Amino acid sequence: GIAIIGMAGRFPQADTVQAFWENLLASRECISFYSDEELLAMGISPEFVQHPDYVKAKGEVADIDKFDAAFFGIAPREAELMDPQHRVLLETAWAAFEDAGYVAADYPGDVGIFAGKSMDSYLMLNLMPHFKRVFSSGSLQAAIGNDKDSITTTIAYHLNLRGPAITVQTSSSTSLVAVCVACQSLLTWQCDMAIAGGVTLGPPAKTGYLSQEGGITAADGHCRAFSDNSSGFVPGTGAGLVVLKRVDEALRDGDNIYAVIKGFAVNNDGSEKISYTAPSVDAQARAIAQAQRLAGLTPQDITYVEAHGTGTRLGDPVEFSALSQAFAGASQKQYCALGSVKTNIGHLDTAAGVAGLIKTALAVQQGIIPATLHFERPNAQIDLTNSPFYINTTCQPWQPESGIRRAGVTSLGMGGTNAHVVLEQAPAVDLQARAPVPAYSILPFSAKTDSALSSGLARFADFLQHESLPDRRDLAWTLSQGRKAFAHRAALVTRDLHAAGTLLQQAATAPFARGVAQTQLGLGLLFSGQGSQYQRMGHQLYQVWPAYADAFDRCATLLEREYQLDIRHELFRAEVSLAQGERLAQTCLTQPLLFSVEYALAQLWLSWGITPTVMIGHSLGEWVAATLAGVFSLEDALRLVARRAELMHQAPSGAMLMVALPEAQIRALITAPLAIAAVNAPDYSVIAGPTSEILAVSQRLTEQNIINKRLHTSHAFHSSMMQDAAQALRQAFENVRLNPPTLTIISTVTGAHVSADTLTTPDYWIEQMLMPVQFSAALQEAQATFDVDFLEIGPGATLTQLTNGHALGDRLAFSSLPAGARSSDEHKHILDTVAALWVRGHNIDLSAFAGEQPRRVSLPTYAFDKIRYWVDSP
Amino acid sequence: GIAIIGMAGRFPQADTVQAFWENLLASRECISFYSDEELLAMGISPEFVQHPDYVKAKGEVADIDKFDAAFFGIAPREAELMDPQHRVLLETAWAAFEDAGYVAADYPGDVGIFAGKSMDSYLMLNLMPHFKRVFSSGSLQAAIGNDKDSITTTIAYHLNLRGPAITVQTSSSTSLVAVCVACQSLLTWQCDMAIAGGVTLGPPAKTGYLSQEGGITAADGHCRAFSDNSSGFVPGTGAGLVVLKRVDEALRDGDNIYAVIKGFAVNNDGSEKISYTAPSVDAQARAIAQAQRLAGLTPQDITYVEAHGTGTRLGDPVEFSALSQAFAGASQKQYCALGSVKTNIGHLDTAAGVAGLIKTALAVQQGIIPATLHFERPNAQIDLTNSPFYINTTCQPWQPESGIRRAGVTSLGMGGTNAHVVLEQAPAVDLQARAPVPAYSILPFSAKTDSALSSGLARFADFLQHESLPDRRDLAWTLSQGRKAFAHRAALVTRDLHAAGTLLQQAATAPFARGVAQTQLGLGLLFSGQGSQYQRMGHQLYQVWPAYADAFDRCATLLEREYQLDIRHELFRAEVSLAQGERLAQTCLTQPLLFSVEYALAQLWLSWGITPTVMIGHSLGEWVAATLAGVFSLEDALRLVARRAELMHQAPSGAMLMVALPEAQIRALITAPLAIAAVNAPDYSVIAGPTSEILAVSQRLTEQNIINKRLHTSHAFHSSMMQDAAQALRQAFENVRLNPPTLTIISTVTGAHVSADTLTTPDYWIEQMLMPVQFSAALQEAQATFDVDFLEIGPGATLTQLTNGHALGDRLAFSSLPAGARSSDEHKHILDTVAALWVRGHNIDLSAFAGEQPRRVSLPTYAFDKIRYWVDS
Amino acid sequence: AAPESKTQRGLVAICEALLNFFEAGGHSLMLGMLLAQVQERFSFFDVMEDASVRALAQLVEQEQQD
Amino acid sequence: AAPESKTQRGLVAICEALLNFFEAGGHSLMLGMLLAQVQERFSFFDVMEDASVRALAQLVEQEQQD
């Protein structure tokens, strides 16, 4: 068949198909009656008002003047000359494609629109200035070019639809004829996805009709259908579009299927009638029997029928006669329902067949038949008791006998064209054999304006208060794979959806990432030194993520192949205790653990598709900023930092000291031979040395009342004490290969943009152990040459705390691991960095955070801001 | 694929598809150029005329105000406010269906229309003669119900089209998108045979345009398409429709297949271009490549390509770049042709795409590529010599390196919709294996009005003055099945078509069947007499038709099995001489022989679907009339008629003299031993009896100035000496089949009707040759009770003059076989009878007169008369 | 019904134009001013007020007396 | 080219509101119609007599003279 995979459309007293399904489930009437005063104020002639046969009701779509011209690139001088049905069908088509879970502009295959349109009454006010000022008929040829035949080409231009763009144009069955033409085109393989429907919108916005004797219109405004008090119909206005796709493709791609269209049939009557404007029975019977013949369905299978049901005196017995003739092969008794949308919203002119198709597809998918209004007693020439049909007046649950629901929509034109479409139930979904939901998920939202982002967040806030909510891998997937990412964007990290609904109910100083996006050509990486680790560092990331797991497994097997370190036991199978913290405190174990964590976490961030420009390191962080630049291999790096750690374990005791003074003032104040260990900020510095004179310097620094801190380190680092251990790895260093770099390292021991040959020198890694890691000028050099965000790689938030204290120029630094306390929040922090990078504009595969086997669902669509465009000439 | 089996269209400076194809073979430029003083007649403002930036050229259809309202039943007040595009597309739909060899309402399956209208231009001079009266909502409601979308539903109503009536509407690709939608409906089984096209003509007639260096219009008037002088196009007006069917069905039924649409593709540009109004390259390349792989073809195979080719300064290199990009899988250099019909006729917005499909299907069918006009050098951007394309300037033969002529039509909409249709050659048939053509054929013509019949006769007069005319069998099976039998009819019985053309050249002085048909409730079968035959009769009818052969069989087999005589030896194995002429006249080998001949002719006329109402006899015809009435069977009457003959043979004397005088005045002076044998007319009588007495009566009448002749017979029929035969046949009629008569029989020995008991008496046949014949009274009761046309069944025209010489007002009599002579022109005369009956209105099947496996043929269509329905200027 | 030799001419004009006509289900507003455009051969909101044969006869007689 | 400081303001207002300047084939009668609509802030046959921007500026001062 041809699966329906999404739908949209404004309606009378509705603006969404879910704000229309809940006007059918509430058994509402959507007709908007008026009074005298507001009608002559709209422009009703003084003769039309106080006329004894002038009814004052119609079905009103809400805002016909309100177009979002900035979304589509249209100037606010060309969109004012656009027919309102063009604008409303543009917004409806964008809404229908977003309801499908797809984007029109970048579908793989070929997408084409088949859509109809009522008569453009907007020109009948446009000609008044266009002709009574210049007296030229040139405007009419422009109308030929860009109005009457060009609705579907305007949609296909502004949404970039490559497939067929055909304006079918039938009198009152235009929409269901368009659905049938779309099904034919999808089955002759002209397109791989279609969007099909219609529109009818009147630039006379609020009006009544002058009902006359024996006239097709009702003399009360209540469209009573299939009843003995039926006096006619009432004119509605509305748009509507469905999205169609072949059912094996739609079931392989994992879309949501409302109802599979199994059969369809269009025909005409052709002079089997007493006059041209009078329907026939046998042609309608041929259409119904042909659609059920093509579907492969006996008429003992269809359980609901949406008749046309306009409520006129003459068309009602003809349609029931045709339905009885086509269903006459059945043997059950009152087993099929009957209905009509036109009781609720009125008789739509062009969008009538797709309003019934939306109502019938919703009724098939949900599984409950709506309530026909105004019906309490049958018609004189219709016998419900000796027919297979019943008309219900309450919202009745739909259970079939065989277990499969089937339906059918009938539409009738005024020229004679008859269309019938036979649906079915969507096939057996299986959402029980899937692996479970990811623990946290990112909810991305985006818009072209801050107003549209605020309104979209408000719409998702009201959507998330419902009891019926989709999955967390069905939602978010549709928000990443099924929405286009615009400038003004926002993002949440959630675990349950109702608390997300509460958070978007605030949408003001609420804890979620939010802001405008930019070009953002590249990221910068910062790597952590020794002294900020915790317990179970990367435990969640190891079991959840596969790339981090693979890199850590290869590092652990590589370390255990040549050494006796019990890697994967000190992190994962280690109890949370201070004995473990003192077990991993020493330098013999801490350096390869930080190397493995920072390397595998860097491989994770490169697996998620961000491209680093500059990779600043810190002590051991430089050894792995080497390794991502590929200056030597992972085997060489891991065994050589093991050799380094087992040399620097033999070094004697030595302490650190922090000072809040710049290094020039420290070098003007230091007298003992104590080298500067690290320069990190203007107001932060670290000095080293053996612990006795370090404590003496700290106690004399207490006398000047300057802030200082012990850094909890056993061995002195970045001072002249380790000369023997520095020299003792030269003979183990020279036997391996060193490669010129690839990625732009800058060196923290010199504070200089470091070149492609001076990493390769085997004495640079000797003097890197001794000299101060002068971080601040390296950071200011990266900030000077580039202009980039920074992402720390490592356990602590130390380097982020240093960096967010430097003039970055509109930029920000971001951590990728919690600072120890919240190790349980490893999975939430790394997904809140990704949610915070994505808002600024960085390129991350957000669909990598999806789940096992995702599917698409129906979420709220874009929220177009309402700007009035109207020529408005009396 | 989808076969194209017919086409029509009212084109610029043409009225038919053939008067457009003769202009494409004559290399004519069909664009009219006006002058200054005739634009101002219909109120073109003098600023437009005196403007120096003004070109006066349009490709005009001939008549737009002329409609035949009375054909479709449309009132002469409601037709005056139909758009002319509805009118022209009604006439084009009727003409295209007649060109297909079909009538739309009587097709077994279901038939869809898919057409495209343009912006109603009649509504501007339909709302200005309306705004005078205050029409607040009146103007809106006038537009809505009438002129929105009702071009494929005021055609499917009038022509009884019971299939999908969908109005596709793109900008200028409408008529090829319509063909692609129709080919989708014929493959997803929504219709069994479709029709698809478009129309664009409107009120603007004799109208010039303000050309713009920077618009899309040609600044001089001519469409120099694909050339160095490409300055735009010129607007045109036109119509067109083609008729489509599945190719297995069209090969099954033997239609005329112009071409087979083997693949097609429609798509849109997208936003992947500069703006809305700028054409793209990759979209057109996608359409061309998609069509050629849905056709199962390869870009080496296509030998003609009909490009869009408007003549504007931006569209021409873009389309050629797309074509080169799509055909860039080729290695052979300059093999495929290139053309644009807009050079000849102009750019008919919307219609462009079925005009260029008609041209391409004609070029595929015939094998002649027409000549692209106005082409001297390529454009600056267009590189011909390394592309695989060349442009002709003379109409060249088409003959590819393979035996199949394949093609492709491309039409591009202004909104961005592109269409490419690939047209393979029609699969050729074994023409030489077909059976030989029947020796004569009826050509029936019929029209709703006398003027339309005269015009449709003049059109076949013009048509048959050509060479290589179609098969005569296939013209007789297309004028009969393929045209709708109307009121005013005419009919021809031909053996060659060129003499038929020069005979239809004259109208008032031409002797064919002609008249007005009526209801014709029934037919009278006046069976003929006894002494009115000739040698070598029924020899043609024995071998031409098998119904006559089967009816003549089971007679002679029983006469050679039971008795010892053979009819076929006396007829077909006999010799043409006067020695046998007196030999077959004896009663022993005349009565059952003539009975079997008349029975065979009557069974033939029953086999051709005619209904007898009254059926009289004359001295043998009551026996075969009772046989056809079911009173006897063939064998039951066959034994007793031979018994009657060989008992009647023994009468020694007998002679009949013919006296032309009222029976009562004859009865005044006749004698006792002679009796009147036959009363046939008020001025006719036949007297029977011996020799000398009736001869003496003859010389008595000779001096009384009354003309008398003998009847050249030897026995005494209806006389006073057959009582011996009446006594002898009384030993017969023993327990024979005795049935009440099923049909209505007037007995000629009584002058009354026949009841259920008046004919089953066995003594009635005993006494039948005793009473005289009351033929005149039988006809007096015949045009008393009924009013029918009398078909004489017999081997002569003897009863025909005696029938027409009675009270035969409004009614005539028709002889089935020639009288005496034309013993070989029997085949021609019997079809001249069927031609004379079919015009009068009888329900004779005309298909039984065609050959073995006939086909359909494009002939001229109906000739609508022209009545002006307009409003004002 | 029985006509009265002037409204007879009016109703014969109506029938030869095209065929109260409101209660006849085959007529609409377009065919309404088709008939009306025939009867200027001798206010349209008054035609939507009432357009019976008696109503058209009364309006034509009143407009001729005016 | 360089326009002369008053017709500069007028023609760049025209260009920023709409866009001989009309060399492209996409320009047509509807944008000509809106350009004819924005006139009276400071004959359409006379406008189409010369569609140049300097020519229509000239016609603006003859309309001011009128």
Short mmCIF file of C-alpha atoms in Angstrom, two decimals, chain C:
data_model
loop_
_atom_site.label_atom_id
_atom_site.label_comp_id
_atom_site.label_asym_id
_atom_site.label_seq_id
_atom_site.Cartn_x
_atom_site.Cartn_y
_atom_site.Cartn_z
CA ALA C 1 -51.26 27.28 -13.29
CA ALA C 2 -53.63 29.30 -15.46
CA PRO C 3 -51.94 32.38 -16.97
CA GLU C 4 -53.50 35.78 -17.65
CA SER C 5 -52.20 36.96 -21.08
CA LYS C 6 -49.47 39.35 -19.82
CA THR C 7 -47.93 37.18 -17.14
CA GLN C 8 -48.48 34.47 -19.78
CA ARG C 9 -46.00 36.37 -21.97
CA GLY C 10 -43.72 36.73 -18.95
CA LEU C 11 -43.72 33.01 -18.16
CA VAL C 12 -43.30 32.03 -21.83
CA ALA C 13 -40.31 34.40 -21.86
CA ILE C 14 -39.03 32.63 -18.71
CA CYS C 15 -39.48 29.16 -20.22
CA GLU C 16 -37.95 30.03 -23.60
CA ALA C 17 -35.08 31.71 -21.73
CA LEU C 18 -34.28 28.75 -19.46
CA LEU C 19 -36.17 26.20 -17.38
CA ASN C 20 -41.20 29.71 -8.47
CA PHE C 21 -37.84 28.62 -9.88
CA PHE C 22 -36.19 28.70 -6.44
CA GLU C 23 -37.94 25.47 -5.42
CA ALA C 24 -36.78 23.84 -8.67
CA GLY C 25 -33.52 22.11 -7.77
CA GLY C 26 -31.81 22.58 -11.14
CA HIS C 27 -31.39 26.37 -10.98
CA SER C 28 -28.76 28.61 -9.38
CA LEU C 29 -27.69 32.27 -9.25
CA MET C 30 -25.89 32.20 -12.61
CA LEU C 31 -29.02 30.87 -14.32
CA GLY C 32 -30.87 33.49 -12.27
CA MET C 33 -29.27 36.42 -14.04
CA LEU C 34 -29.45 34.45 -17.30
CA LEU C 35 -33.24 34.69 -16.90
CA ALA C 36 -32.93 38.28 -15.62
CA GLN C 37 -30.79 39.35 -18.61
CA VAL C 38 -33.54 37.90 -20.78
CA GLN C 39 -36.17 39.96 -18.96
CA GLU C 40 -34.50 43.28 -19.64
CA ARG C 41 -35.69 42.76 -23.25
CA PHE C 42 -39.05 44.34 -22.33
CA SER C 43 -32.71 45.61 -7.90
CA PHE C 44 -31.28 42.09 -7.89
CA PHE C 45 -31.37 41.99 -4.08
CA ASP C 46 -35.15 42.15 -4.47
CA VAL C 47 -34.77 39.11 -6.73
CA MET C 48 -33.06 37.31 -3.84
CA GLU C 49 -35.88 38.65 -1.64
CA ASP C 50 -38.52 36.85 -3.76
CA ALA C 51 -38.29 35.64 -7.36
CA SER C 52 -41.51 33.75 -8.01
CA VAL C 53 -43.46 34.14 -11.27
CA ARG C 54 -45.95 36.35 -9.42
CA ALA C 55 -43.00 38.25 -7.90
CA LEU C 56 -41.33 38.91 -11.27
CA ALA C 57 -44.70 39.87 -12.79
CA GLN C 58 -45.39 42.31 -9.94
CA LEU C 59 -41.90 43.83 -10.14
CA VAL C 60 -42.02 44.27 -13.94
CA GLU C 61 -45.51 45.82 -13.75
CA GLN C 62 -44.42 48.14 -10.92
CA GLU C 63 -41.27 49.19 -12.78
CA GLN C 64 -43.29 49.83 -15.95
CA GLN C 65 -45.76 51.91 -13.93
CA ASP C 66 -42.80 53.78 -12.39
#
